Amino acid sequence: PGGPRFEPLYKDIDPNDEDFGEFNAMDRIIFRNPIRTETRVAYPYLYNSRPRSVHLSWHSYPQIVYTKTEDPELPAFYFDTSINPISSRAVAPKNL
């Protein structure tokens, strides 16, 4: 959604040549919440029978926990209001 469209890379597969022989039985696979296309793009070798010349995207990054300072008088180091506080009972060594 929001991405470009190109020509089909491999336009050499049709659903009708492969008859309902033994493996593609729709009365065999169990149906849940549908698989959107982003799932096939994110994990291309699991959700595609012929994932040819696909590129593995970077999985994830550690979250940036940075917030810009809207108050140009605060110090550089301060406890921001968006930061959840830490309590003495949030430390609480139980068994010492």
């Binding site: 406890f79 830490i86 609480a92």
Partner: peptide, 24 residues
């Protein structure tokens, strides 16, 4: 130091929070 930008005492409190979570 650079992401959270919390003062040094709060940095100590964060460090102790992580250590107590591991020990918990």
């Amino acid at each position: 130091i650079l992401e959270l930008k919390i003062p040094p005492t709060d940095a100590y409190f964060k460090l102790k929070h992580v250590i107590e979570e591991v020990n918990t």
